[PDB]
A paper describes a structure:
We present a 2.4-Å resolution cryo-EM structure of complex I from mouse heart mitochondria in the closed, active (ready-to-go) resting state, with 2945 water molecules modeled. Our structure has a fully configured ubiquinone-binding site that is sealed from the matrix and an α-helical ND6-TMH3, so it is in the closed mammalian active resting state. Although most of them are located in hydrophilic, membrane-extrinsic domains, densities from well-ordered waters were observed along the central axis and E-channel and in the ubiquinone-binding channel. Here, we explored structurally defined Grotthuss-competent networks at the top of the ubiquinone-binding channel but could not identify any complete pathway to the matrix in our active resting state. In our mouse structure, we observe a complete Grotthuss-competent pathway for proton transfer within the E-channel, between ND1-E24 in the ubiquinone-binding site and ND1-E143: E24–Y228–E227–a series of ordered waters–E192–S109/Y142–E143. In addition to inferring the states from hydrogen-bonding patterns or simulations, it has been proposed that only neutral carboxylates exhibit well-defined cryo-EM densities, and here, we observe clear density for both oxygens of the ND1-D199 carboxylate, plus density for a coordinated water, suggesting that it is protonated. In our model, the ND2-E34 and ND4L-E70 carboxylates are directly hydrogen bonded to each other, and the density suggests that the proton is on ND2-E34, not on ND4L-E70, consistent with this suggestion.
Residue numbers in the entry:
A (entry chain e): 1 to 105
B (entry chain b): 1 to 83
C (entry chain K): 1 to 98
D (entry chain a): 1 to 69
E (entry chain D): 20 to 225
F (entry chain B): 33 to 189
G (entry chain A): 1 to 115
H (entry chain J): 1 to 172
Write the structure that this text describes.
């Protein structure tokens, strides 16, 4: 912060709920807790400029976990290729993908 | 303090609602400080297990941790059973 | 989530466009501010739910608390405007050009 | 006389017992002779879904005891 | 720097206070009655209102003006008497008594003793009839509907005293210059006594 | 006649019965005659036990009881509230003043009978009619409504 | 699904009654019948003109007091906390300042309606 | 049911378009009430409960005050609706057409970007703790009383100071 | 089967509403030394059906100054919301089991005021506008304390779930520990239902008919049906919150019978109150709530936060 | 009386929550196997559906890291019926 009063007094008015990995009620981890913990820990102590290049792996993973652009696209591609094959009559979904599974347990 | 007593008596006769409101407000603050059961309310919230108690790896240096849930080690709840 | 957040951002943009493009009533503009508040509340709430961020759920409530204070002051000002001119029209609020 | 008010009251009284009684009976009829399950929390929903999956007939309320293992 | 656009600008006021044209008084004007529960069916009370604050009451009357006073000029004195029943038509016999006394004065005659006691007796029965209507309808306008019903059953019994002396429940035409039209039927005083000894309890309930 | 005519006739009875049984007069009274109207509502006669309930709004009223003298100054207002009653609507003229001007028939300021202003279904004589005489007229209006044949006439058109 | 189903039936029942009420009865539309009611005389102005609000200050106070109760409605979940003393102080302080705010407005005559 | 949340967020968008056109504040107030209800449904749809019901309750109270203020200080002889003015009506219709166009085109160019009409319903709930107990949104809000007390201090101060502020603004 | 259950809630509630119009008119009559309806059916039991058939056979108003969309919508919204308030009511098992059923009630009840506000505004007449602005004032009066009163009670319940109130009261009426809140709650439900002595939005002695003055025929009947349904609802709610009917897991119908008896009694006191008191002035209702109920409600909320902590009596979350 | 009854209701809740604790290991093991089997089934159909697609790697992660990433609901039920997907999105929240 512009004035680091909280750090000087050693208190926490708003430092402890700043990101996903922070403490949650009843220890219910937020989505992408492990990815955000890895990104924050990679970046610690080296500054923002270096962190941008050198923690790029961690940020991309966390970004994928949270926003899920690649996961959505990959499923869109599989479901689109399945639509093409079924119209051509070359693919038949199995019974467990058609609602006739043998449920577990 | 005879001047206030006449004041309080008049307020009781003429503005009883406000007298009750202030008295109830003052009692609500006072009661937790003088009650012997105040300490248990936090202890009861602390004994409610909403989460799975994850076991610890035994390293051979845990004389205080039970090895079974019916070992005589660990936190007892006899205080609550007889509350 | 993807399409819902797009629509919510568009809803904010429309409410802001409403705020920026005055008609006559000041009250109609005060309603557009409440529209932006409402959009931002849902966006914050949906984000917290989608990420399971329970420590952030106080924040949407604080958004509404200060919006209520903003709306109360806006209405209080509107009483003053109406007392001066007998309407809430913004074209009367032009004495400070000179 | 005042007791001539009672025919309307009795009709009111009968009409106000039917909703409670009918809901309780229709629940048992549609939940295998038991109370309709209440899923206040996700854990309870999970148990119902597991009950539905092991039932063999896709109904959570058809229960399986030790005869099934 | 003067410009064509800003040629009409004046300097602001020295104390920042502008003299603006007088703002428009915009009170709501409302017809309260004649067709209104509180208007007695014939009062057109024109109200100036600010919110529900009443700024002016302008009562428009004459919606029951029937020209009684002109009509009386074409009547004999006895023929005019029933017009007085229909003035304060809640206090019928008292209106008769006023007109009877005025005529008796101009005639320089007096009504006999028993007539005067009857006239006071029924004058005070009439006052109760009036105060019941005054109190309970006033309560009914304020929302307390029930006292109207208890006390109008008492009124119905007093209408029977009217009908027993005169044959009419309301417009008796019973008090006339010179006394009253007929003497009391046998048994009327006893029934007035029976009513009178219970009425104060009816007042206590209200 | 036919079974379609029989059914129509029974429906006339049903709708007629409903309007008979729930007559809501306007809270509307002009002079002394209105006092006797209060006495019909009072406990001895209790008009509400027949289903008769005053409502102040003309939009929620079925009957206008012209209970008192109708002056020229009042006539437009009475016509207005009559026009603002939804149909089907009925008028009961109560007392000599409303019936034909009564004691004030020859006045410059008085309408000689409210039936110069509105249509009238029942004329109740008296000055005032007793609460019971008014109640009799209300029960005569109910029997008039019982005779309405609007659906039978529609069927035969 | 069930909550959606019953509320739609509630909407469906209400709208059917409205349609019956508008298409069953015999009508007779004419101007004097449909003019606005005002006790038998014509209105002298529109009902759409400004209507003064004498309790306007209580009204905007109600806006703030309605967000105060919104801050109080999590209390059933908050009493489950281990940090009972913290929760209790926060709730006590919150209620007390709201009382002081009401007390100030009361003594400033802010609850009195304007004349 | 796979279109449920998109339909709701689409209804919400129309409500804000109606508000943005600024008819008489009477209908503006109604527009926010409907949008608030639709917004409550969206929060519910994403697994919310307390937050959705709060915002509707708060906006029900808020628009009742605005109704009262509108009848006193923001009213004209002929209040405008959305249909009253051809120009406002046209931009209402054009705005709805431009919404269909914007969603249609964005679906074509990316197909999975901002708009993914093929995948609607597949990406609403991401993760859910299946066997959990303490998970409802009210628990999160209640942290103001224990773990996020600073959030409640500032919220409480603003309401308290708001009383003193509005009393000062409104005195003559 | 769920559709049959909807019928066996809605239809009996609508018949209960219709006969409450009869019970009100007879109870008021007898307190006034009259009889009330006793001709239209035996002891007047067909009088509600006659009034219903009359109204829906009557010409409905189409006033010229009226803004017609809101004019039609408002009575439609009124009956919808009145019926919707019943679906989460546990008697002892609800049709719809809601986690935050109490908050559902407040939100639904709070939307109900807009039927009054919009009908009065849409009618575009002076007496209807007066009635609408009294509704604005009425809600500001009571809504400020109604939710805090509920809040304090539910700190002994431990949740917003209506079904949990049954278990909370297994051994004792909530009346006993909460009677001061029960008293304030009871006055609030009278104002919330626009009932005497707070029948101000209609108040016929002052505004002729207030918000619904321009309404006729079947549209008028919807407002009346909605008002009488809400009276039963609010008293049934008072019964479940404070007067916990006796519950036994193997005798559910015992709860329903006991619930009905107490709900019938609380509805009778509503009619009894109407027959007894004059009307408040609508500025005086605001002062009653904001200068008497609100101070005590705030003190008692603080007391009911304090109580479970210092008695170690926090109710369970589940 | 409320103090005593609520103290009893707190003891009952602990007993109920302790029954859940005892059973949670079994539910965790079942859920692990169920999730993995569903993911396995998706992988086999991906091997057939994406057979003749250039540059497609069957089973490829979208992440650099090699630690286990739990699947999303969209991933698990992406290839199954609309009802199974709707039940996962709305089952609990629409059960009343
Ligand atoms: C209920 C069904 C409608 C029935 C109305 C009716 O009785 O017939 C009148 C009408 C017949 O013609 P009319 O009686 O001569 O019209 C005169 C009305 O007074 C003139 O009608 P009005 O004065 O009531 O004004 C109509 C106006 C007012 O109507 C409304 O907008 C209220 C309902 C909106 C929901 O509606 C519009 O402007 C068009 C509404 C378009 C939908 C709103 C979309 C933008 C807002 C988004 C938020 C959603 C809220 O139909
Ligand atoms: C695509 C749009 C989708 C819809 C999205 C709508 C967004 C919310 C709408 C909020 C608009 C608003 O409240 O303003 C009120 C503002 C003030 O209204 P007012 O005080 O009641 O009276 C002036 C009106 O002209 C009313 O008085 P008037 O009747 O005397 O106006 C005369 C004139 C007004 O001329 C116009 O039609 C203005 C619109 C020009 C077309 C713009 C196309 C959209 C781009 O009308 C005409 O004769 C031309 C008709 C043919 C136009 C085509 O009205 C306007 O100026 C037009 C409002 C509608 C325009 C919405 C388009 C927003 C896009 C941004 C435009 C600015 C861009 C500038 C940088 C580039
Ligand atoms: C929907 C609700 C309708 C339920 C009420 C229906 C019965 C109403 C009549 C009633 O009860 O009063 C009896 C009335 C009572 O007599 P009354 O009303 O004429 O006399 C009352 C006065 N005292 C007290 C002195 C007797 O019987 C009649 O004489 C009138 C006949 C009315 C018939 C009503 C319709 C008959 C049913 C037709 C159904 C449609 C046919 C389809 C083919
Ligand atoms: C909670 C209550 C909600 C529901 C309320 C329902 C109440 C109605 C109960 C059912 C009765 C419905 C009767 C119609 C209502 C009255 C409307 C009205 O008066 O309009 C009069 C109108 C007036 O017609 P008119 O043509 O004479 O009028 C012409 C113009 N003026 C008015 C100027 C004279 O008549 C009708 O249109 C009647 C139509 C309905 C006909 C009855 C059904 C047909 C049955 C045929 C027999 C079939 C036999 C088959 C077996 C052999
Ligand atoms: C919208 C339809 C709502 C139906 C609700 C139940 C009411 C049924 C009886 C009225 C039927 C009105 C009708 O559609 O008549 C045909 C309409 C005439 O409607 P109408 O103007 O005669 O409606 C009045 C009905 N009576 C005569 C009984 C009062 O004619 C058409 O074909 C126009 C389409
Ligand atoms: C005309 C307008 C009529 C409007 C009627 C207003 C009614 C009051 C407002 C209702 C909004 C609150 C609804 C609610 O909270 O129900 C939530 C319900 C799930 O209930 P929950 O307790 O969370 O249990 C799930 C876990 N077991 O969720 C569900 O079961 C289903 C999803 C809830 C959404 C239903 C919304 C009501 C229906 C609106 C119909 C359209 C009206 C236009
Ligand atoms: C509508 C339908 C009508 C209601 C139907 C139920 C009516 C039941 C009537 C029977 C009730 C019998 C109660 C006993 C009455 C006789 C009696 O013994 O008095 C008891 C007590 C007064 O006792 P007492 O000694 O005479 O007076 C001096 C004492 N200090 O007086 C009491 O305190 C007893 C109080 C009895 C209250 C129950 C009766 C009222 C029921 C209507 C409730 C309100 C309806 C709205
Ligand atoms: C593609 C276009 C198709 C052709 C469209 C033709 C439309 C013509 C509609 C004619 C009107 C019908 O609409 C209806 O008319 C009747 C009588 O006519 C009137 O209805 C009411 O008012 C009048 C007033 O005197 C009474 O005579 C009538 O008995 C009553 O029912 C109303 O005006 C309307 O309810
Ligand atoms: C200007 C605004 C003024 C209004 C605000 C005033 C707030 C002040 C509150 C004073 C009361 C605090 O009351 C305090 O309650 C807590 C629990 O809540 C008690 O705390 C006790 O019980 C708790 C459990 O809850 C134990 O963990 C603790 O060790 C024990 O002290 C304190 O003994 C008592 O002192
Ligand atoms: C104000 C109201 C606005 C209404 C807005 C429009 C509502 C209707 C939404 C249409 C959007 C697409 O709606 C629907 O999306 C689903 C995903 O859930 C698609 O899903 C389905 O078809 C597509 C291929 O065609 C594949 O994903 C797959 O075969 C199947 O899941 C549907 O084919 C599409 O029709
Ligand atoms: C000038 C005006 C400002 C002065 C008035 C305000 C005074 C401050 C009052 C608010 C005090 C907040 O006090 C602060 O509380 C939080 C919890 O909420 C504590 O936070 C502590 O517990 C949390 C629980 O999650 C941990 O995550 C955190 O790491 C730890 O520090 C802080 O250690 C304490 O400093
Ligand atoms: S008829 Fe007789 S009683 Fe009736 S108003 Fe005329 S004078 Fe009075």
């Amino acid at each position: 912060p512009f004035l680091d009063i909280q750090k000087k007094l050693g208190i926490s008015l708003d430092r402890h709920f700043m990101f996903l990995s922070a403490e949650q009620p009843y220890k219910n981890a937020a989505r992408c807790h492990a990815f955000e913990k890895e990104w924050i820990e990679c970046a610690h102590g080296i500054g923002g400029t270096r962190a941008k290049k050198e923690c790029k792996i961690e940020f991309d993973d966390f970004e994928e976990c949270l926003l899920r652009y690649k996961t959505m696209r990959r499923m869109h591609d599989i479901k689109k290729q399945r639509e093409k094959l079924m119209k051509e009559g070359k693919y038949t979904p199995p019974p467990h993908h058609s609602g006739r599974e043998e449920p577990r347990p | 303090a005879g001047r206030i007593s006449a004041f309080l008596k008049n307020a009781w006769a003429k503005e009883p609602v406000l007298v009750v409101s202030f008295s109830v407000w003052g009692l609500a603050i006072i009661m937790p400080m003088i009650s012997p059961y105040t300490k248990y309310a936090s202890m009861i919230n602390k004994a409610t297990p909403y989460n799975y108690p994850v076991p610890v790896r035994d390293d051979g240096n845990m004389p205080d941790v039970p090895s079974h849930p019916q070992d005589p080690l660990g936190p007892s709840l006899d205080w609550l059973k007889n509350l | 989530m993807p399409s819902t957040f797009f629509n919510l951002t568009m809803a904010f943009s429309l409410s802001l466009l409403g705020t920026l493009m005055f008609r006559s009533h000041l009250m109609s503009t005060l309603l557009c501010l409440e529209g932006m508040v409402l959009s931002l509340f849902i966006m914050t709430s949906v984000t917290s739910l989608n990420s399971n961020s329970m420590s952030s759920m106080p924040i949407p409530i604080t958004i509404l608390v200060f919006a209520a204070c903003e709306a109360a002051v806006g209405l209080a000002l509107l009483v003053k405007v109406s007392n001066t001119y007998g309407t809430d029209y913004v074209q009367n609020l032009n004495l400070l050009q000179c | 006389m005042w007791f001539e008010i009672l025919p309307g009251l009795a009709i009111m009284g009968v009409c106000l017992v039917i909703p409670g009684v009918s809901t309780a009976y229709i629940h048992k009829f549609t939940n295998g002779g038991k109370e309709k399950r209440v899923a206040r929390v996700q854990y309870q929903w999970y148990l119902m879904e597991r009950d539905r999956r092991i039932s063999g007939v896709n109904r959570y309320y058809v229960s399986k005891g030790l005869e099934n293992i | 720097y003067p410009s064509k656009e800003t040629a009409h600008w004046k300097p602001p006021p020295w104390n920042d206070v502008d003299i603006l044209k007088e703002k428009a008084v915009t009170n709501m004007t409302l017809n309260f009655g004649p067709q209104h529960p509180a208007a007695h069916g014939v009062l057109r009370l024109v109200l100036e209102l600010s919110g529900e604050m009443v700024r002016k009451c302008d009562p428009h009357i004459g919606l029951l003006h029937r020209g009684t006073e002109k009509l009386i000029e074409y009547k004999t004195y006895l023929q005019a008497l029933p017009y007085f029943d229909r003035l304060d038509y809640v206090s019928m016999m008292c209106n008769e008594q006023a007109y009877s006394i005025a005529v008796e004065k101009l005639l320089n005659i007096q009504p006999p003793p028993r007539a005067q006691w009857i006239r006071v007796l029924f004058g005070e029965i009439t006052r109760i009839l009036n105060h019941i209507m005054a109190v309970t309808t006033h309560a009914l306008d304020i929302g307390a509907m029930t006292p109207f019903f208890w006390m109008f059953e008492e009124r119905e019994k007093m209408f029977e005293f009217y009908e027993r002396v005169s044959g009419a429940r309301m417009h008796a035409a019973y008090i006339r210059p010179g006394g009253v039209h007929q003497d009391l039927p046998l048994g009327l005083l006893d029934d007035i006594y029976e009513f009178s000894k219970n009425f104060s309890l009816r007042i206590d309930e209200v | 006649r036919s079974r379609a005519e029989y059914v129509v006739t029974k429906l006339d009875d049903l709708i007629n019965w409903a309007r008979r049984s729930s007559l809501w007069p306007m809270t509307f009274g002009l002079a002394c005659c209105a006092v006797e109207m209060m006495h019909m509502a009072a406990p001895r006669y209790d008009m509400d036990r027949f289903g008769v309930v005053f409502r102040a709004s003309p939009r929620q009223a079925d009957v206008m009881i012209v209970a008192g003298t109708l002056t020229n100054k009042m006539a437009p207002a009475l016509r207005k509230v009559y026009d603002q009653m939804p149909e089907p609507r009925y008028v009961v003229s109560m007392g000599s003043c409303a019936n034909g001007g009564g004691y004030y028939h020859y006045s410059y300021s008085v309408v000689r009978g409210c039936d110069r202003i509105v249509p009238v279904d029942i004329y109740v004589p008296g000055c005032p009619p007793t609460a019971e005489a008014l109640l009799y007229g209300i029960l005569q209006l109910q029997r008039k409504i019982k005779r309405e044949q609007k659906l039978k006439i529609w069927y035969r058109r | 699904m069930n909550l959606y189903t019953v509320i739609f039936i509630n909407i469906l029942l209400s709208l059917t009654l409205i349609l019956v009420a508008f298409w069953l009865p015999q009508m007779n539309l004419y101007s004097e019948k449909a003019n606005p009611y005002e006790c038998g005389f014509d209105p002298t102005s529109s009902a759409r003109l400004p209507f003064s609000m004498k309790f306007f200050l209580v009204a905007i106070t109600f806006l703030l007091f309605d967000l105060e109760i919104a801050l109080l409605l999590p209390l059933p979940w908050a009493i489950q906390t281990i940090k009972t003393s913290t929760m209790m102080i926060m709730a006590f302080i919150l209620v007390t300042i709201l009382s002081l705010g009401l007390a100030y407005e009361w003594t400033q005559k802010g609850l009195e309606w304007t004349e | 049911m796979n279109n449920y949340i998109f339909v709701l967020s689409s209804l919400f968008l129309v409500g804000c378009l109606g508000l943005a056109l600024k008819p008489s504040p009477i209908y503006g107030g109604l527009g926010l009430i409907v949008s608030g209800f639709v917004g409550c449904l969206m929060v519910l749809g994403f697994g919310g409960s307390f937050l959705g019901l709060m915002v509707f309750l708060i906006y029900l109270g808020g628009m009742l005050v605005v109704f009262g203020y509108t009848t006193a200080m923001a009213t004209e002889e002929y209040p405008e609706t959305w249909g009253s003015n051809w120009l406002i009506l046209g931009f209402l219709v054009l705005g709805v057409i431009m919404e269909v166009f914007l969603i249609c085109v964005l679906n074509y160019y990316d197909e999975v970007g901002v708009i993914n009409l093929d995948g609607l319903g597949d990406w609403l709930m991401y993760e859910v703790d299946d066997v959990g107990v303490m998970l409802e949104g009210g628990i999160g809000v209640a942290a103001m009383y224990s773990c996020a007390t600073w959030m409640m201090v500032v919220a409480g101060w603003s309401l308290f100071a708001g009383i003193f502020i509005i009393i000062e603004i409104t005195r003559d | 089967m769920f559709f049959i259950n909807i019928l066996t809630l809605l239809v009996p509630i609508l018949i209960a509403m219709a006969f409450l119009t009869l019970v009100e008119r007879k109870i008021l009559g007898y307190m006034q030394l009259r009889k009330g309806p006793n001709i239209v059916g035996p002891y007047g039991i067909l009088q509600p059906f006659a009034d219903a058939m009359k109204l829906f056979m009557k010409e409905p108003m189409r006033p010229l100054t009226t803004s017609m969309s809101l004019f039609i919508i408002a009575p439609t919204l009124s009956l919808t919301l009145a019926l919707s308030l019943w679906v989460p009511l546990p008697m002892p098992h609800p049709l719809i089991n809601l986690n935050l059923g109490i908050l559902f009630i407040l939100a639904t009840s709070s939307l109900s005021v807009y039927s009054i506000l919009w009908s009065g505004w849409a009618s575009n007449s002076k007496y209807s506008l007066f009635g609408a602005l009294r509704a604005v004032a009425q809600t500001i009066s009571y809504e400020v304390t109604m939710a805090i009163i509920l809040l304090s009670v539910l700190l002994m319940n431990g949740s917003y779930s209506l079904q949990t109130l049954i278990t909370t009261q297994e051994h004792m009426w909530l009346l006993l520990p909460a009677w001061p809140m029960a008293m304030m709650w009871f006055i609030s439900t009278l104002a919330e239902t626009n009932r005497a002595p707070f029948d101000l939005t209609e108040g016929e002695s002052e505004l002729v008919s207030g918000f619904n003055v321009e309404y006729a025929a079947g549209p008028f009947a919807l407002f009346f049906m909605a008002e009488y349904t809400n009276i039963i609802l609010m008293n049934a709610l008072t019964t479940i919150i404070f007067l916990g009917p006796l519950y036994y897991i193997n005798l559910p119908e015992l709860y329903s019978t006991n619930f009905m008896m107490e709900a019938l009694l609380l509805s009778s006191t509503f009619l009894w109150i109407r027959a007894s008191y004059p009307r408040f002035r609508y500025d005086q209702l605001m002062h009653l709530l904001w200068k008497n109920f609100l101070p005590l409600t705030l003190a008692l909320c603080m007391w009911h936060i304090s109580l479970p902590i210092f008695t170690a009596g926090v109710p369970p979350y589940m | 009386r409320m103090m005593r009854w609520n103290q009893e209701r707190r003891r009952l809740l602990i007993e109920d929550l302790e029954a859940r604790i005892a059973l949670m290991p079994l539910f965790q093991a079942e859920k692990d196997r169920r999730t993995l089997q569903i993911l396995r089934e998706n992988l086999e159909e991906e091997a057939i559906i994406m057979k003749d697609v250039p540059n497609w790697k069957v089973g490829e992660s979208v992440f650099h890291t090699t630690r286990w990433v739990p699947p999303l609901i969209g991933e698990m039920y992406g290839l199954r019926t609309k009802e199974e997907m709707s039940n996962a999105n709305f089952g609990f929240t629409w059960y009343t």
